[PDB]
Write an enzyme that holds these catalytic residues in place. Structure first.
Site, PDB file in Angstrom:
ATOM      1  CG  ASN A 112       1.753  -5.042  14.387  1.00 31.48           C
ATOM      2  OD1 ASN A 112       2.407  -5.933  14.926  1.00 31.48           O
ATOM      3  ND2 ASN A 112       2.182  -3.789  14.294  1.00 31.48           N
ATOM      4  CB  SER A 116       5.626  -4.246  14.641  1.00 34.71           C
ATOM      5  OG  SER A 116       4.795  -3.329  15.343  1.00 34.71           O
ATOM      6  CG  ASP A 162       6.189  -3.457  18.400  1.00 38.17           C
ATOM      7  OD1 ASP A 162       6.064  -2.488  17.617  1.00 38.17           O
ATOM      8  OD2 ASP A 162       5.463  -4.457  18.346  1.00 38.17           O
ATOM      9  CG  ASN A 201       3.613   0.396  15.646  1.00 37.58           C
ATOM     10  OD1 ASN A 201       2.845   1.325  15.957  1.00 37.58           O
ATOM     11  ND2 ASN A 201       3.245  -0.589  14.828  1.00 37.58           N
ATOM     12  CG  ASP A 227       0.286  -0.675  12.793  1.00 34.14           C
ATOM     13  OD1 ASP A 227       0.301  -1.800  13.308  1.00 34.14           O
ATOM     14  OD2 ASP A 227       0.468   0.364  13.441  1.00 34.14           O
ATOM     15  CD  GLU A 253      -6.921   0.542  12.832  1.00 36.35           C
ATOM     16  OE1 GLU A 253      -5.842   1.166  12.678  1.00 36.35           O
ATOM     17  OE2 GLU A 253      -7.248   0.017  13.921  1.00 36.35           O
TER      18      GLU A 253
END
Length: 130
Positions: A60, A51, A49, A46, A53, A35
């Site tokens: 998220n 958002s 959308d 991202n 992380d 990750e």
């Protein structure tokens, strides 16, 4: 902060991650490794959308933490996404525990499916004294 492998393994163990909801420490290590490369300041936007992380577990903003800039998002871990960018991972671990308390479990992270599920993850905790 970018944790060293064993340093993180013991850190996670001290925080109660080993076997949390059936998930071994090695699986959590494999998750963090893929990750963020064990990097607490890791972030991924991202654009699709809107958002982001956050942190070592790349959690998220649409569902888990609040950053005030993700449309119609919720804050299930009831944490500011800033909490997921600290060198101290206690808050992030509390959020990761919240994440797996859902139906999917560790499968919530697609990266875990791609890189850890049905793989040899023993290597992640070898020699760490955990």
């Amino acid at each position: 902060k970018r944790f060293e492998r064993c340093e993180l393994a013991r850190t996670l163990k001290r925080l109660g991650m080993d076997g949390y909801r059936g998930i071994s420490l090695a699986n959590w290590m494999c998750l963090a490794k893929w990750e963020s490369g064990y990097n607490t300041r890791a972030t991924n936007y991202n654009a699709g959308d809107r958002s982001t992380d956050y942190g070592i577990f790349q959690i998220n903003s649409r569902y888990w933490c609040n950053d005030g800039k993700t449309p119609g998002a919720v804050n299930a871990c009831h944490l500011s996404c800033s909490a997921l960018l600290q060198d101290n991972i206690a808050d992030a671990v509390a959020c990761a525990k919240r994440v797996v308390r859902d139906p999917q479990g560790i499968r919530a992270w697609v990266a875990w499916r791609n890189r850890c599920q049905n793989r040899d993850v023993r290597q992640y905790v070898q020699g760490c004294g955990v």
